[PDB]
Amino acid sequence: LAGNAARDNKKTRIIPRHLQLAIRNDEELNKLLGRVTIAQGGVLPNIQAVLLPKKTESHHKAKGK
Amino acid sequence: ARAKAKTRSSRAGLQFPVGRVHRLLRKGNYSERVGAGAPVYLAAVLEYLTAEILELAGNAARDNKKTRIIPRHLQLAIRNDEELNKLLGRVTIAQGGVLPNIQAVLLPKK
């Protein structure tokens, strides 16, 4: 499961980042290793919604100056 | 002789026209007798539907840094909502394309 993730980044080596991305991907692997923290691993690349507060960006001014 | 003759917003509270709906429904050979407070319901329904469609189109167009509703944005907004997909399922909007949907088997997996 780690080699397939390593081959995605064009890397034939099993670096700790690949193992961290592979363990935190599978459901059973994450449930079994939920408290284990891999050194030099990192967080999974994932953003978060609800970040922009203006969304609609309406015309508070006017067309004629 | 009369008085102020004030009104609401326009004539009932909707921006959609009322004098043309009753005319097109009476002269459209739909029924020999048309009600008085009947075209207001259809006008309000059409106004709400148009407002929802335009809001969805604007929300879909604002993502591409373009404040102008184009038919592509309309096609993207119509084919995204679940309530609007079942209504206009047999409608093919011209110059709209399709949706970026690629099967997972076609992608180079393991």
Partner: protein
């Protein structure tokens, strides 16, 4: 006189750079051996049982030009309404 090309397009033109380009929009990746041939035949009926309706409509009003106002009523009978070019 007249040109010898009286074939009036024997259902051609739509070949490799057209059928593949149209299939790439949907989701088709590869194309087998046959695939074509009948691809230009399934579109023949779509114009056989649709343009006839427009001709029959224009024949009722004693006209001779199939405008855009009559091509939308023919497609509405089958169940494929088009918005924009019709009006």
């Amino acid at each position: 006189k007249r040109h010898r090309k009286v074939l009036r397009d024997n259902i051609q033109g739509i070949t490799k750079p057209a059928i593949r380009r149209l299939a790439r929009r949907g989701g088709v990746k590869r194309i087998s051996g046959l695939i074509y041939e009948e691809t230009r035949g399934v579109l023949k009926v779509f114009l056989e049982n649709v343009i006839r309706d427009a001709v029959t409509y224009t024949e009722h009003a004693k006209r001779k030009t199939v405008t855009a106002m009559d091509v939308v009523y023919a497609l509405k009978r089958q169940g494929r309404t088009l918005y924009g070019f019709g009006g």
